[PDB]
Structures are given as C-alpha cells and as structure tokens.
C-alpha cells in the first residue's frame, strides 16, 4: 500500500544546543509529501525484507505491543552482525550478534534467530523502546554511530498520519557501523492478530530547521518541494515577502562528495629544518625549496609549541586542507629584541640590512628560544649579522658580500679604522642576558601557489571519481558543486583577462590522473520564483530565463524530482515572454496597474478564486 507522509520525519541533526536560530543542514532526511509503504500484517507475513538505502522512518499506529522491535542485517546468513532490538516488559536488549534469522520472524521466547557464536557490543539499556499513539522512529547509520530517534505522540481519532509537525527527540548513539543494506520489521503474536506500519526511506537533502527560545523545533522545509520551498531555503526565513526572488541549485540535491586531493603518500621531512645541528646566520639564510610532499602541519604545532606562532595570510589552523605548489623554508637565528621585526611591513635592523619579508606574504614565521643549546661560556661568536650597509635590500634577497664597507673619503683597503668599519658584527650570546638578548631560532615558511600542478598537498583522504552525477567536488581546493562530465578540451583554460570577478569555474583537472573534467550546473537557467507572500496564500510561479517553453524540461533535468514540481515545470498553462517562459499563471488580456515585475515589463500579482495571473505593462 502507498500513502503520503504529511511533513513528518524531521529530527535534530546534531547535539549542539541551538535556540532562536535557523540552521541549514545537509544531512539525511525524509522528503515532505513522499511515498511511504503502508505494510499491513495478517495471521505469517505480507512482505519480504525491505532494502535499507540510507535510513528508515518507521511509524506504527497499533497497540498492545504487537510490533515488538526491529531486525537489521546485510544478508542475515553467517556474514555480518545483525542489529536486533526487542522491547521486553520493562527492559530492552540491543544485542548486535551473529544471528541466523530464519523465515519465521516471530517472538511469542526467542525464535527470531537460530544461534549466536561471535557476539559484538551488546547494550543492556533499561528504558524500553516501546512507550492510540504514533510511534515515530528514525534509524540511520553514519558509519560509526547508529542514530535512533523517537517521538511518542497521541494519535487523533480515526486517522493514520496526523497533520502536524513533531520533531523526534534524539536518543543514545549506539556504536555500530558494520555494513547494513536491508531492514525488516519484527512482529509478535500471542497464539500462533493484525498490525500495520509505515516505512519510509531517507535521502540526502538540505533542511532549514528553526529552533525557538525554549530549544524546540516547530516547523521545517524540505528544500526539494515546490519552488516556494527553495525560496524558503535561500533567504533563511519562513515568511517569504510578496515579491519575485531567486534560488540556488537545490533541485538535483547532490548526494556525494568527491575529494581526490592528494597523489602521493611520502611524508615531508619538515623535521629537517626545525631541529638542525647549526642554524644559518642572519646574513646568509639557507633557503630550502620543497615540492612533491605532503603538507602535514600536524607535526609543527605538536612539537613542544614555540613562541609567537603568527601565521599571516592564511589561518594558523586548518592548514592540512589548503594545498600549495611549493614550500620555501628559511631558517636563521637572531636576538630576542627583534624577533617581531621579521613580519610584513615591519622595519628595523634585521628588516633593512638582512632577510626581509615581502608586502604580500602568505607564509608563517615561527621562532623559539635557544638559550640552552646556542649558548657558550663566553658567548657564541659564529653567528653574524649585517648592521653597516647603504643599500636597502629588497624582499627575498641575500647579500654574502664580505667586502669592507666604504664609509670614508679615502679607500680603507681593509684596515677598518677611522670612519670605516665592517658590515658584519659578532654579537655574543652570553647566558647572563635579558629577554631582549636571548638567541631565538626563527623559521619562515613561504607557500607558493602558482598556476602549476600542485604537488605538496594536505593529508586529506582520496575519494572515488563519480562522474555524470551531481556531486560536491573539492579536487584541489576548488570547493564547488556540479556535474562532472568528460570533456574534449585540449588544455585547461586560465581565465585571467577580465580578472574574473563575477565568474565561476568551468573545468578542472583531477590531481591523480590527468583528465580535464568539465563542470556543468546541475539545475539552472535563471530560475526565479514569484511569491505573493506566505501570509496571503501558498501558490507560486516559476520563471526560466533563457528557454522557449520547450527546453525547460531538459535544462533542469526534470527526471528525478518531486511530483509537486512537475506541475510548475511542464506544459501546464505556459506563457512565452521576451525574458523566458512563465509557468504557473494565466496571461489575461486586460489592463491593470503594475505589480511584482516578473521580467521585461511584465507585471503580475495575486488576485481574482484568486490565482496567480500575469499581464503586460499598462502604459
């Protein structure tokens, strides 16, 4: 039997406390006004085991505890663990053990399973999972926690599914995650009765959940219903005003996320320039260029954290995701007084005649005290720094010219006497020194991200390349959403002529294999939604800018959608305009004052019963 789910199945996505907010989540939910299976029971069964796709929305209106739990499993024949739940008189067991569920799934006293040899985690939870009244449960496995929800609500008189929102309160998260692809409803019988339960399947869809001040949910939108629902999930509100609005790609509702970030697995030798035997001096910094690596910055801050870990340009944390093309590691040792002068824009002693950072710098500088290893009884005399010069060094310059600085009228010829000195100075690192004289070893990491195949990326995992399907792609930092198609382009274009301010990515390259993949919009065409206001009515209209009333079914891919949208995106009283094709109105041949502008002078409103009409501008 088939029925309709009247906006039921909205649970709490996470456990974070939220109040008086509107949160847009992207978890698995039950679509509103979907087709649920109303499976009845007679007394051995009426239907075989149902396939578990993403989640199960179980509902029951019977009483006397006929439906006494549930049974899960993949093949149920000595292959994997089976999630068994049975509600006893007061207690309930959630024993996930190897069970041989036969063709007799009856309880009344255990006859559902045949035997059990290898039993995994078992729960002895005391609160029973049983309590007319509608018993709403939402079972969903997220590969590590099998979230089960429940909402006990007294049902109405002579009805099956009430007309009212009821959010399911979350329960404990059971540690599961073994493969589950099928679901079956467990039933009981006094003497070898009848029952009936609703079953629905969850899909990945966005949801705008509204939390009030008390911390409860009162209304939600599936973001996959009629264009009013998409308008509801693009303005972050529940009271759409009387006016034409836009929407986003909430139609196809992508379900997969592809990463494909890295290409190699060899760790980077970042523990080779931070713990060297003898760091370079100030006048000659040993720059090390590194490419074809793995940008694993987890070993940097977890290395007895140092002082002044100031990362410019990029964020200090969340660096294990953004991938660059090369990393330049400079390392030297200075005094404690000018440990902050090595920064973009700073000016001083080591920022004028020594290593200087550029104005725009997307690297990070980190220094650490070395008053225990870089210290001598009479002070270290090996380290040197330039202090007497005349040419301001440009960013990323090295000057190893040990020639005698000319400062007098007559040539010094190396005597370094009156009015003539040496550019280098041996500042000793005496132990008995203040904070402004302690030796600090400083390492600067410059991140070069050029228009070249990125080599040193983060430790992010590698997903599978699923093409010809609306997915969210994060190939090499380009986080977008679209359909990946196999194009026939020679080389990836580099759009830099008009600076591409209001532009988007058209094609990308897989970092693993060199294949130019074109990115197409899953559903677009300038979809404008004409709304007269939620306070007035609930009838809307659609406008597709760039069609001729015939290319609209193939533009938005009206093949796998809701049956409530095919009435506003088909040949139902269409009207071709100079801007597009208005579907969902009736063009009148009268003259009225102008109203909500649909496009190209066309004004429309909602009146007479009253319905959405359209008329040209009455000049």
């Amino acid at each position, epitope marked *: 039997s088939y029925t309709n789910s009247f906006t039921r199945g909205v649970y709490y996505p996470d456990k974070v406390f939220r109040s008086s907010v509107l949160h847009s989540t992207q978890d698995l939910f039950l679509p509103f006004f979907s087709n649920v299976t109303w499976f009845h029971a007679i007394h051995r069964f009426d239907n075989p085991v149902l396939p578990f796709n993403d989640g199960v929305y179980f509902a029951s209106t019977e009483k006397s505890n006929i439906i006494r739990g549930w049974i899960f499993g993949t093949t149920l024949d000595s292959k994997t663990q089976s999630l068994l739940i049975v509600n006893n008189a007061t207690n309930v067991v959630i024993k996930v053990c190897e069970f041989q569920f036969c063709n007799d799934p009856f309880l009344d006293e255990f006859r559902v399973y045949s035997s059990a040899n290898n039993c995994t985690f078992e729960y002895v939870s005391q609160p029973f999972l049983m309590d007319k009244n509608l018993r709403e449960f939402v079972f969903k496995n997220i590969d590590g926690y099998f979230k089960i929800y429940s909402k006990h609500t007294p049902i109405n008189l002579e009805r099956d599914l009430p007309q009212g929102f009821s959010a399911l309160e979350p329960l404990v998260d059971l540690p599961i995650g073994i493969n589950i692809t099928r679901f079956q409803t467990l039933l009981a019988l006094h003497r070898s009765g009848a029952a009936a339960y609703y079953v629905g399947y969850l899909q990945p869809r966005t949801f705008l959940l509204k939390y009030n001040e008390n911390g409860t949910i009162t209304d939600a939108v599936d973001c996959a219903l009629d264009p009013l629902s998409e308008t509801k999930c693009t303005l972050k509100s529940f009271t759409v005003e009387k006016g034409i609005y836009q929407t986003s790609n909430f139609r196809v509702q992508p379900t997969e996320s592809i990463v494909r970030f890295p290409n190699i697995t060899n760790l980077c030798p970042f523990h080779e320039v931070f713990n060297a035997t003898t760091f370079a001096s100030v006048y000659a910094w040993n*720059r090390k*260029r590194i490419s074809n690596c793995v940008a694993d910055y987890s070993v940097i801050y977890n290395f007895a954290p140092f002082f002044a870990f100031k990362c410019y340009g990029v964020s200090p944390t969340k660096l294990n995701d953004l991938c660059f093309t090369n990393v*330049y590691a400079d390392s030297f040792v200075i005094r404690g007084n000018e440990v902050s002068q090595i920064a973009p824009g700073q000016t001083g002693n080591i920022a004028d005649y020594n290593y200087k950072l*550029p104005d725009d710098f997307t690297g990070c500088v980190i220094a650490w005290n070395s008053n225990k290893l870089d210290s001598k009884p009479s002070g270290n005399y090996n380290y040197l720094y330039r202090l007497f010069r005349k040419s301001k060094l*440009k960013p990323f310059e090295r000057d190893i010219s040990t020639e005698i600085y000319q400062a007098g009228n007559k040539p010094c010829n190396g005597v370094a006497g009156s009015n003539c000195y040496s550019p280098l100075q041996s500042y000793g690192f005496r132990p008995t020194y203040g904070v402004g004289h302690q030796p600090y070893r400083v390492v600067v990491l410059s991140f*070069e991200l*050029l228009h070249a195949p990125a080599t040193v990326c983060g430790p992010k995992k590698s997903t599978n390349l699923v093409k010809n399907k609306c997915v969210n792609f994060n190939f090499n930092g380009l986080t977008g959403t679209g359909v990946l198609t196999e194009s026939n382009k*020679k*080389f990836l274009p*580099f759009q830099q002529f008009g600076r591409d301010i209001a532009d988007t990515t058209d094609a990308v390259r897989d970092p693993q294999t060199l294949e130019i993949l074109d990115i197409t919009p899953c559903s677009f065409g300038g979809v404008s939604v004409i709304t007269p206001g939620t306070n007035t009515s609930n009838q809307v209209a659609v406008l597709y800018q760039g069609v001729n009333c015939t290319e609209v079914p193939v533009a938005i891919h009206a093949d796998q959608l809701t049956p409530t949208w095919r009435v506003y995106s088909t040949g139902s009283n269409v009207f071709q305009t100079r801007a597009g094709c208005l579907i969902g109105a009736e063009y009148v041949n009268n003259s009225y004052e102008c109203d909500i502008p649909i496009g190209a002078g066309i004004c429309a409103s909602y009146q007479t019963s009253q319905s959405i009409i359209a008329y040209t501008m009455s000049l």
Partner: nanobody
Amino acid sequence: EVQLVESGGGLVQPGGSLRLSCAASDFYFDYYEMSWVRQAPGQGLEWVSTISGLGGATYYADSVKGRFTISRDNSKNTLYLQMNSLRAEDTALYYCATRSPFGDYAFSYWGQGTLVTVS
C-alpha cells in the same frame, strides 16, 4: 609600474626553433614569477611554463615537457624562451606575464605578446 615589451617570434616553418625575448624597463622584483601564456585563434588562452621567482625551479606544462626551455637573467632582467619541435600546435600569440607567488592566480603585468605561426 611599467610594461614588458616582447619580440622574436614572427613567421616560422614546421620544424625548427626560434628564441623569444622578454625585456623589462623598471622591473626589479627578484621574487615575482614570470610565465608564458599562449592564446590560439578560436578557443581561449593556455599556459606554457613559468619560473619560480623565489628560487630557480622552472615548471612547464604537459605538452611542452621535453621540448621547451625557459631561462631568466637577472643581470639585465630578461626572460628567454626556446621552443623546439613546433609541429602543428605552436600557432598562437604568446604573452610574457609576471605575477606574485603570494596572491591570486590573476597576473599583474600584461605584455604585448608576439604572434608565432607555424606554416
């Protein structure tokens, strides 16, 4: 603050190599990377190769791997490009662009470019 004039590539024949020069008048940044950008009639523009300004490591494209070579001379601040085995896909306009390694992908200096036709 200035422009980068180009010369060299005029009319060539299938099979050979011609030098492409890129000069600079008031350019003194020793860390800004310099690259070549090819644009063929019809489809958009593509990337040939680039030189890392922070060091001396050059990065070429996939089609120009074992046939192109770039060189940077800081004495007179010039860029030289030598392209070998120009069979059929080297008929385009080449631009000598310069951008900063730390920033966006968009270049910071647009040159005049020279048209090379392999016929």
